Amino acid sequence: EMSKAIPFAERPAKLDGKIPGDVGFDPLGFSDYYDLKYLREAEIKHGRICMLGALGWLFPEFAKLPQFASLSTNPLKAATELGPAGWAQIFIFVGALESFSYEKIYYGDSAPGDLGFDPLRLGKNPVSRAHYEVAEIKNGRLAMIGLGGMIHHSLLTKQGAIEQIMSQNFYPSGFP
Amino acid sequence: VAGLTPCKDSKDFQRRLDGSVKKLKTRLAKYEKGTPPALALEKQIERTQARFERYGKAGLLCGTDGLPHLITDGRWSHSGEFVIPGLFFLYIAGWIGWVGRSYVLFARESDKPTEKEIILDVPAALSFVSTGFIWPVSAFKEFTSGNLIADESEITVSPR
Amino acid sequence: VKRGSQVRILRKESYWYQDVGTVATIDTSGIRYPVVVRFEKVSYSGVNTNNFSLDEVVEVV
Amino acid sequence: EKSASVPFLSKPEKLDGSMAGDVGFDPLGISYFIDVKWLREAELKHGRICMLATAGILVQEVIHLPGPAFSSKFALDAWSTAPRGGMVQILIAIGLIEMVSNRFAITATDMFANPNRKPGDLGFDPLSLGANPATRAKYELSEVIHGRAAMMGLSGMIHQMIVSKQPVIDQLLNFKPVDA
Amino acid sequence: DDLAVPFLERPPMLDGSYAGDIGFDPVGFSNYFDLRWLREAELKHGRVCMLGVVGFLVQEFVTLPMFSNGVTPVDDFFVVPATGLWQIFFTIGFVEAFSNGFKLTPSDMFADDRAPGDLGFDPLGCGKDPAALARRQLVEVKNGRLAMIAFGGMLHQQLLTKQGVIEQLTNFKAIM
Amino acid sequence: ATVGFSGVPSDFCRPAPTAFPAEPAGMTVFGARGPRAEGHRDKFGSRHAAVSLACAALLWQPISQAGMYSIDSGSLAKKSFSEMEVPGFGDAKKVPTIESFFPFTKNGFDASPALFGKDSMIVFENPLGKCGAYASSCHTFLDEMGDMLKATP
Amino acid sequence: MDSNFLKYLSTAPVLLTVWLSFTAGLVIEANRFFPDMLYFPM
Amino acid sequence: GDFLVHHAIALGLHTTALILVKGALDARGSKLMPDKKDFGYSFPCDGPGRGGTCDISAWDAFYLSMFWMLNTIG
Amino acid sequence: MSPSIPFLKKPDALDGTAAGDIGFDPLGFSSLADIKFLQEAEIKHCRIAMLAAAGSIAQDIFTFPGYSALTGGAKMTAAHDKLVATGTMGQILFWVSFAEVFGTVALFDTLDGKRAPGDFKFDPLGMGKKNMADMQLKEIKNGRLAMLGIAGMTHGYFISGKGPLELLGNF
Ligand code: CLA
Ligand code: KC2
Ligand SMILES: CC1=C(C#C/C(C)=C/C=C/C(C)=C/C=C/C=C(C)/C=C/C=C(\C)C#CC2=C(C)C[C@@H](O)CC2(C)C)C(C)(C)C[C@H](O)C1
Ligand SMILES: CC1=C(C#C/C(C)=C/C=C/C(C)=C/C=C/C=C(C)/C=C/C=C(\C)C#CC2=C(C)C[C@@H](O)CC2(C)C)C(C)(C)C[C@H](O)C1
């Protein structure tokens, strides 16, 4: 009856706590209006995107591929520097990956975010599978928040995350 | 800087300021010192000078005509020209619309809705006026709960 | 549809199409448009009542 | 039939004397058109804020946090000298406090939706001093009277500071009557 | 029988089953977390710190031929090749994964209800007998706690004095 | 008529629940009194809050004066953790440390076990100075009233 | 006050006139104390 | 100046399109005259019956859009 | 009525069983705050103030070697400041805070009724095994006297710049 996330508010009707990563947090009630399976798939995809993005916002600051050594440790500056051909190849790779999602969303039914990618067979144990599902959701959420923060910090300081931390210019000087 | 020059260092802006001040001083020259007309014209001169100085320091860009121009493209260096004012408007306008809609529904569920609409129930109207300050979350809550958008089969429509 | 029941109009030419009214009486004599529906909203002609057939009205929940 | 505070005016009908500090004072009859629950919630909020405001104006003149930004005996000058980012942080924190304390019920249409919600009762009793029925009524009356006194005092302090352009204690110790 | 803190009640979850239980949990971590997980963490910390104390003692006198010797054991870490450090890290990771059977999280670590700290490591069979097993469980936990404290002290005093433990004891200089 | 600002959505024709949660009487220091899940007050009660706060203060005590202290030079010298260089992380020789979480020095705040330090200390300014309520060097409000009462046109 | 007089004050044109006069006064005083504001100061 | 006159032109185009599109879409019927297609394209009106039905035709929509089109091109 | 204040009625929250309870509460703080919390606070203040007063007197009489060098002969709060700069006061505060964590735990067991206020079960020499009520009354009385005494010593130091005994010698 009562939401776990907000103990003083009634539990959202669609969020009954059975689905992974459900703590009854929906103050604005997106689940009432929009399809819950679609919302879950979108959340999982965003979490995966942002997990990779948060990892790659910091990895070049530690090591760069020999081809892209000259590219800036600032991820935005590196994006500007990469050039149309490499970005086009990345876009084609991403579109080839997203063709499978297109097929699974519009012409198939399955667990939200299940594209059949489990090469190492880490999800066969049900208990470990449940822990991994919740962990994926929560790490994706944390990565979304962290990567949004990272993008804005790079906008402000015009530097990488580690460089900003080391130089301790944590505070803004105004709009860029 | 975008396509124009800063107004703080524009000969055209300085010339416009000089012309305005000279017009006011010419008008002032025909009035005795300390008289209400002289005081009014001196206050006008002070206001003109303050306005021009503030415009110069605001970072506004000025064209060849010597008048400030607004860069309403989204640039954060010029947010105060259109975006932040626009956000203030949208806030106030959504406040007004939300409270008006709330009062419309309140009068709809009354004994005489038309009477409530011509002769208002100002206690309830002020209640809604107060409610209007979180209209964005309230409006989105209404939308998601389905109390905002009506179904296509429940709205009258003319024949094709 | 019975007396004192909310019914949504399904006649396309009607001012109250897809609108709800209250059934005031249903005539079982066998006339073309037995049911009589009263509306709060007045039409352009100023009439708030009309006669409808049983296939042009659907009970609402 | 007649108000206790203002004998010649009739007793406000909506003021039944249940609330603390009720002396039948409502000459303009606000309670007729505005719910007394909302009015008392607003009264307690204003009184609490003004209690804190008077305490702060009087205290931060003698004791300050370290730093030139916080070193300002004059309160209206402190308003400007204190770090603007810090002041905006205080504003955001006050907003979040209002939201959570009122439990998402922050409007005139939903504030008292729960019957358990009582005027001015936000669930704030960290040390549980209000659990004693014997002293609860006295504490309520003291809170209301304190809020009223602090409201008047804060208003007077703000405007006397506008006039004298000197702190409250500094004004009282070096008083200079108003001249133009 | 005797309680560690006489003026505090015996913690509800500490019933004496585990070795070294003297009812010491004033902050009541056992009331929040699984005691099996807490004891596993305790034993892992104790074992790592026992080895670490022995390493602090040995490293200051004996250095392997392949590696260069730092002034202090804490500095030996910075003196050694980084790829060697990474190899050790990954080997420890593989050891942990294999010992736990790829059940590394609180959700599944004790899915088989294995005794905390019981990784099946008894090459010499020193734990065959039962009474010796209990006495040595007590010895292990007590020595692990002592080694935890001792390693903290050694690490910090070595960082302060920039001298080995025995070197500091032989040439003791007050900080002020 | 209608009494406005009732706070009851049904009076204003606004959406509202049908069953409102009851109000339990449990309080958590540094918390609020209101509906909570079962066992919430027992697990995370005033004891939890207070003991956690005490632990937080005890952990703050090292953090406030965080830094590598060394007596190699013969005197206690403090050096920022950022100075230490870490192997095996490629370009990033210097890596984030506790100072990243707590940038006291960047803001020029001299933290201490207790919140404030010598350089950053609460400033007590005596308001009285050498003033007296009456017949003093400073002209007080009471002095003004007296002088007006004894004034000569 | 007479309830009928209060209803007459609550009538639509009276309320519109009073509210728009109040709004005009708000804007006029805002422009009197903070004039020539062509932009939000940033 | 070009910006302002361009947005004036946008207003003119949008209002002429409004009149013409409304005429085209309501030509077959509206709530006032739900049987307009029976009367055709350019009938005068439907009388003062339902509050007045002046200029209730798609031809009348064209007739007004021609003022607006003359305004925009001007 | 109240034994201490005959003309005032006995404070309700004061039943009289507690050590040092003479019905002295004219302002009724016991009616405001939990008497167990108040008793714990009183015993804490008692012990700290007794240690502080004895430390003041013993610092006037004698000073440990090395501390005199570090503090430059400063006394009382000046010594506090000098040794804060040194780092000793930091160690004292760290270990007192470590004690006070378990002090908080003990405070909440008192508030739960499981522990008597101020009872840490510390009696290694077993002095409190013959009449605990008598020793508790002695402790409370000495602690109140020591609170007043430390107030007097600290404020005499603020007045004069001199410690307790040095003040009594000069004055
Ligand atoms: C001092 C300057 C000024 C003035 C005098 C006006 C005056 C006006 N504006 Mg506003 N406006 C201004 C600045 C100003 N504007 C600025 C700077 C912006 C840019 C953000 C806008 C953006 C704006 C919009 C987007 C609209 C207006 C509209 C209007 C007119 C009707 C407003 C109304 O009925 O509110 C009372 C409020 C209501 C009736 C409620 C419904 C309408 C409001 C605006 C909705 C707000 C919330 C909503 C979610 C916003 C979605 C916008 C998105 C679709 C683009 C009115 C003549 C409206 C108009 O012309 O309609 C034909 C309109 O829709 N203005
Ligand atoms: C848990 C500890 C551990 C394990 C289990 C382990 C196992 C194996 C195995 C079998 C599985 C092989 C086949 C292997 C091979 C090599 N190891 Mg390795 N190793 C461990 C630790 C270290 C450390 C600390 C160093 C190191 C190194 C090298 C070098 C290169 C030497 C060079 O560069 O000349 C080679 C070829 C050194 C190094 O890389 O130095 C830059 C170095 O410092 N190893 N190692
Ligand atoms: C599917 C699957 C597989 C897999 C896989 C893989 C490859 C999984 C990869 C997972 C990854 C890369 C996850 C990354 C998560 C990153 C997070 C949560 C970052 C948070 C950052 C934060 C909070 C921050 C921040 C910060 C900000 C914003 C500001 C800064 O000043 C400070 C700071 C830095 C703190 C494999 C291939 C094994 C197959 C198998 O069959 C199953
Ligand atoms: C509730 C609660 C708690 C609490 C609490 C707290 C923090 C309570 C705090 C209460 C406070 C700060 C009350 C302050 C009242 C101030 C007043 C009445 C000022 C009047 C000034 C006047 C008349 C004046 C004036 C003047 C003017 C204008 C002109 C000047 O020339 C003269 C003068 C200066 C005289 C705690 C935290 C313990 C927890 C508990 O579980 C629940």
Ligand SMILES: CC1=C(C#C/C(C)=C/C=C/C(C)=C/C=C/C=C(C)/C=C/C=C(\C)C#CC2=C(C)C[C@@H](O)CC2(C)C)C(C)(C)C[C@H](O)C1
């Ligand atoms: C717990 C426990 C144990 C214990 C213990 C311990 C360590 C007990 C320690 C007890 C101590 C230190 C008691 C100190 C009391 C001091 C007082 C009353 C000071 C009064 C000062 C006054 C009146 C004054 C003054 C003055 C003022 C105002 C200003 C000055 O200018 C003048 C003057 C000096 C006259 C042991 C170890 C035995 C074990 C046992 O199993 C249990």
Ligand SMILES: CC1=CCCC(C)(C)[C@H]1/C=C/C(C)=C/C=C/C(C)=C/C=C/C=C(C)/C=C/C=C(C)/C=C/C1=C(C)CCCC1(C)C
């Ligand atoms: C396309 C383009 C244009 C210009 C910029 C750039 C070149 C980088 C490029 C790309 C831009 C991109 C990818 C921008 C992306 C922006 C992102 C990811 C922004 C992220 C914003 C995230 C925000 C606020 C999160 C707010 C979270 C809040 C309150 C959380 C508060 C909470 C708390 C504290 C307690 C529990 C409840 C709740 C509500 C969860």
Ligand SMILES: CCCCCCCCCCCCO[C@H]1O[C@H](CO)[C@@H](O[C@H]2O[C@H](CO)[C@@H](O)[C@H](O)[C@H]2O)[C@H](O)[C@H]1O
């Ligand atoms: C702890 C991690 C929390 C992550 C969430 C943070 C989200 C939003 C952070 C917004 C940025 C912080 O806001 C900040 O901007 C102000 C701009 O004047 C700063 O302003 C000041 O800050 C510094 C001192 O703190 C000074 O050295 C700067 O010179 C000064 O500009 C304030 O320090 C702070 O108010």
Ligand code: SF4
């Ligand atoms: S006025 Fe309008 S309605 Fe009357 S006749 Fe002429 S056109 Fe038809």
